[PDB]
Design a protein around this ligand. Structure first.
Ligand SMILES: Nc1ncnc2c1ncn2[C@@H]1O[C@H](CSCC[C@H](N)C(=O)O)[C@@H](O)[C@H]1O
Lengths: 265, 265
């Protein structure tokens, strides 16, 4: 009669909370989805070994089209867990799954875990200064989406930071790198000429948040566009004007050039 | 010979990540602060029991003025952990403590935990639609903070949601309720008269996120301003223009007036 939405956290199998682990261990059935994102620092086998339960993976179609006939039926007479990378319901489509549960007469509870949304606090950028977020999508065929560029423009003009999620082909385990994202933004800039993203733009790259050894780098596009930030996943941030404390953290912790203390504050 | 900043999560001792627990258990010294937020579902005793170590609680003064005299000295010859509610670097100034660690020759690591900043996803509002955040602070003497009002205005004009952290005076055991925040906002409205926050404004309240049964309520200020949302901590959200699915969730899960389903596109 109960369905638990449980977050797996940021990077590996230990990023789930103690609460989520203990609840998952007591569930009769455990499902999981790895299409909204992946857990790059672990494997399905390691997660399964930690929880001590067989884990049934669901595709985007299984969930979006058949959640009510795959998961809910079992939840009607058993304790069922639905694991998701990060924090449950951060992904935009997951919230409605609670409505499906309600419709089916199934109780649902959410067990939170760290999300990249809050983990960006490790960049030293003040969380309250982040504005609207966006996702950088790979262009394809005759389609060249650029809404993420407009998001940066609108945030930056108001002195806010912009968190940019990078494209991912979960099923193929293919990640867009911060380097590719910078190249794309420069390309969009050459097209719109809004003066939003250039070689002189200060950016921050956060790779493998959640790991004990994440890569945190800050600097100008001209210098970082060909830098190796390590293995995925990568997150790109275009900060707005910086509070001196933010700049000092970027210099001392993220290796940013001293120049940001006079140019970006 | 290391310093760990470890988050404890949203509500109780089990909101810590498995990673954070296993590391904290092996540290030589464990310090913590409980003034940046309120963990309403646990006690120092229960946390100490889970980690199996004595926890030295520090005051805001101990940290801000003497972190390098109380904590860092030990981290030079031992493994030390500094625990905090939620995520250690979200809506705190703890990021700067990493600079103090460096300058003192101490390597530091960050272990994330569930944060209210991303937990608001449970309200059904799209996380990417949240704009700049703000804090509603208690007026003191002749000083009456009002900056949070302008934040709501700025976000709303862009169709973005506004997350409002509520004030906390840990030493006085005072935790601002969503009710007190709404009252303060109505007073600022009468002053600036910008039509930003009125009795007809739709708001969302999330209380005790992290618990299994948090209070999630949506409705007009005139109806919610005197409603009992249970014990603290509370967070207040002022949504911007709603997507249909957001409205459906607010109605189905947060008990909002069904009239909001009729979005004015
Ligand atoms: N479990 C919870 N439920 C509702 N609001 C919460 C909360 N935890 C924190 N808050 C909100 O955030 C304020 C403290 S701000 C510090 C936040 C913390 N670092 C984190 O990551 O969550 C509180 O006064 C309250 O308004």
């Amino acid at each position: 009669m109960v369905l638990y939405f449980i977050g797996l956290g940021l990077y590996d199998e230990r990023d789930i909370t103690v609460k989520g682990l203990e609840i998952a261990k007591k569930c009769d059935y455990v499902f999981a989805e790895f299409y909204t994102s992946l857990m790059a620092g672990t494997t399905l086998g390691r997660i399964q070994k930690l929880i001590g339960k067989e884990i049934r993976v669901l595709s985007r179609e299984d969930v979006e089209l058949n959640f009510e006939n795959i998961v809910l039926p079992l939840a009607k007479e058993n304790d069922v867990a639905f694991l998701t990378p990060g924090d449950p319901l951060v992904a935009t489509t997951h919230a409605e799954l609670r409505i499906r549960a309600k419709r089916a007469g199934v109780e649902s509870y959410v067990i939170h875990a760290p999300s990249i949304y809050s983990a960006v606090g490790i960049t030293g950028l003040h969380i309250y200064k982040f504005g609207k977020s966006a996702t950088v999508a790979y262009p394809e065929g005759n389609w060249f989406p650029t809404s993420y560029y407009d998001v940066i423009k609108e945030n930056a003009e108001r002195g806010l930071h912009t968190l940019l999620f990078l494209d991912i082909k979960a099923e193929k385990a293919m990640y867009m790198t911060a380097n590719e994202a910078m190249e794309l933004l420069l390309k969009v800039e050459d097209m719109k000429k809004g003066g939003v993203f250039t070689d002189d733009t200060l950016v921050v790259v956060l790779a493998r948040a959640g790991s004990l050894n994440p890569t945190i780098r800050a600097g100008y596009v001209k210098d970082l566009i060909r830098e190796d930030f390590g293995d995925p996943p990568h997150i790109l941030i275009v900060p707005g004007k910086l509070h001196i404390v933010e700049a000092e953290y970027l210099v001392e912790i993220a290796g940013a050039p001293r120049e940001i203390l006079r140019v970006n504050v």
